[PDB]
Design a binder for these strands. Structure first.
Lengths: 72, 38
DNA sequence: TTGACTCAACATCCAAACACTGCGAGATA
């Protein structure tokens, strides 16, 4: 439960599991029943957001990147 | 809003002497004002 | 720990009265 625990994405229960096995070490969110999967490559994550202790809503947010080919 | 509430948690690693006359006057005025208030 | 130097870059004080319209350039119906 260190780099892989029970995490949520799009309101469905899940199992986050960091995938550090490839050149980009990523964060694999795997639904608890397995319905929805979401892999977050920490390589692109600019900064992490954690609902601090003051944020009783314990929600962490993963700040990403704006790559030259993605800019809006 | 969302960044204001939910704090970014990260590990960003990282390894003469005389002012102008305008400041002179500003300091004199601020000195007066401050004195009066005190 | 004291203050009297010197240096240099500004800042600040202080002195204390001539008139005003003519006249040639170009252009002008």
């Amino acid at each position: 439960p260190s780099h892989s625990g029970a995490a949520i994405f799009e309101k469905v229960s899940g199992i986050i599991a960091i995938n550090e096995d490839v050149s980009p070490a990523e964060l694999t969110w795997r639904s608890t029943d397995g319905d929805k999967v979401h892999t977050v490559v920490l390589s692109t994550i600019d900064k992490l957001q954690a609902t601090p202790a003051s944020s009783e809503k314990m929600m962490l947010r993963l700040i990403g990147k704006v790559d030259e080919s993605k800019k809006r | 809003y969302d960044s204001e509430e939910f704090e970014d948690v990260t590990d960003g690693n990282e390894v003469r002497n005389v002012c102008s006359n305008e400041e002179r006057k500003r300091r004199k005025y601020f000195h007066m004002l401050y004195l009066v208030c005190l």
